[PDB]
């Protein structure tokens, strides 16, 4: 799963 800040 991706980190919270991959935005």
């Amino acid at each position, epitope marked *: *799963e*991706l*980190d*919270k*800040w*991959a935005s």
Partner: antibody
Amino acid sequence: RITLKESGPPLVKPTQTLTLTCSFSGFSLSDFGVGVGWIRQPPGKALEWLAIIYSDDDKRYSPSLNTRLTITKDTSKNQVVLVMTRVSPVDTATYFCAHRRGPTGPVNAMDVWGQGITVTISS
Amino acid sequence: ALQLTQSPSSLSASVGDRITITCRASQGVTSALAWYRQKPGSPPQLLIYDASSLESGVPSRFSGSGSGTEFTLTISTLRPEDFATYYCQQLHFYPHTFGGGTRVDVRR
């Protein structure tokens, strides 16, 4: 600025529960996006990621530990707590809690660390 | 999960030396990679955040570059306080992985 300090028992018996507390100042868990993580390091070994909790409360644990870890935060105390169950000698290490910046780019790192608390597991 | 391989794992050098160490990931982590220096008995200390940004307060001799699966940390001129162990960490995927570390000691 920001400083953090780990506290808890230096000695824990195999099987028991290890409760760790991270007290910090210079930031609060209500600032947007801010996180606090836990990193451990066995004697003479590499750093190992344990878990992280954020301002809005989501948290993540290391897959290979997650049925043994519980991370929480009390915001009036400005502390984060980590509970590790059924510890064994292999859990003997130095435990660090660290701060992670929230979006104002540079959220890509744990910028300030505690000094660490070394915990030894023995009966 | 994501494997971060640091190399060389051990390195021997002298004050005034220029060294470059690497950390590479099994999957692309974009620019979410940080570098730390850890001296015996002390906690890790942030040098580089977001792969190439020098952390405020960190000496200019330290620099980082890379993106995706390849990253490097370079020390333009080795100082006494640099003989320590260096670690990289990616914060793009959970769990946040640390490399195995790079050990820099004094050459003789």
